[PDB]
Amino acid sequence: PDEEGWVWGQIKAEARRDAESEPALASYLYSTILSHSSLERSLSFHLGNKLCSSTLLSTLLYDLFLNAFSSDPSLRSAAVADLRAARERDPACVSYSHCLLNYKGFLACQAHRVAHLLWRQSRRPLALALHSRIANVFAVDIHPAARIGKGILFDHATGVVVGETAVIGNNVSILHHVTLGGTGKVGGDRHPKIGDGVLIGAGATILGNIKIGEGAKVGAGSVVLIDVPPRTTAVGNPARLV
């Protein structure tokens, strides 16, 4: 009945249709989704399997993710907001279950939120180990110390880089090959601050500690080295306001 409850209900219904139509995937859909009663448990199960390695057991990571989601209401809210963001804004128009299972941006983002929590809980070696796996597996390189809001859309997430001192607001869309990073300058605050509702086009590079205002749009291929005011469009190399 509630928002999360309804979304989870949709995920199960969709998974059940997919399991019935594709016997090669039926058991995996059962073990990941249909055998569970919550989004948190299914997401944790899936992330544990996706990110496991010889260093990190899938059952260990499953525990880690599940504990984090069960302990932290804001992580659950963020996951549902990000599922909604994909359902609403994804150009390829995703079902909830396909986003949950297959969307690398979405999955990397939820896993990053747990890495960020570890980082804040003074478990930085583990935060960094998790970060390394997320990069390995989802081609998403978001430093655990980066701050990101919710309702985030990560389209063709491969090669996304978000630096250590970056800040990303709510309802931001980050397309393919976006770099939110630095000049090569050593130390300190050196990564961009991205306002709510910003759209960053494919291949855009945004460098230095500059501001990208609320609702602004960055055109594809742009190299943005200056502050972009709210509700404006910046495009070009170097980027200029349009």
User: How far, CA to CA in Å, does 16 sit from each of 11, 86, 149, 164, 218?
Assistant: 9, 21, 31, 40, 40
Choose one: 3-11, 24-32, 33-41, 108-116; the region binding a copy of itself (CB under 8 A).
24-32
Is the C-alpha dihedral spanning 50, 173, 87, 156 positive or negative?
Answer: negative
Select 74 or 120, whichever has its Cβ closest to a copy of itself.
Answer: 120
Residue with tokens 């079902």: 95
User: Strand, coil or helix: what is 173?
Assistant: strand
User: Strand, coil or helix: what is 222?
Assistant: coil
Q: How far is the CB of 2 from a copy of itself (least distance, A)?
A: 26
- Interatomic CA distance for residues 133 and 138, integer angstroms: 8
91 binds a copy of itself (CB under 8 A): yes
- Interatomic CA distance for residues 75 and 150, integer angstroms: 9
| Among 85, 90, 134, 149, contact with a copy of itself (rule: CB under 8 A) | 90
| Among 139, 210, 211, 233, contact with a copy of itself (rule: CB under 8 A) | 139
182 binds a copy of itself (CB under 8 A): yes
CB 210 within 8 A of CB 204: no
CB 200 within 8 A of CB 173: yes
Dihedral angle, C-alpha 119, 32, 158, 227, nearest 10 °: -50
Choose one: 36-44, 108-116, 125-133, 226-234; the region binding a copy of itself (CB under 8 A).
125-133
Q: Which of residues 185-214 bind a copy of itself (CB under 8 A)?
A: 185-187, 190, 199, 201-203, 205, 207
Provide the annotated binding site for CoA.
182-183, 202, 217, 220, 233, 240
Binding site for a copy of itself (CB under 8 A): 18, 21-22, 24-25, 28, 49, 54-56, 60, 89-93, 98, 102, 104, 123, 125-126, 128-129, 132, 135-137, 139, 141, 143, 155-156, 158-159, 161, 164, 173, 175-177, 179, 181-187, 190, 199, 201-203, 205, 207, 220-221, 223, 236-237
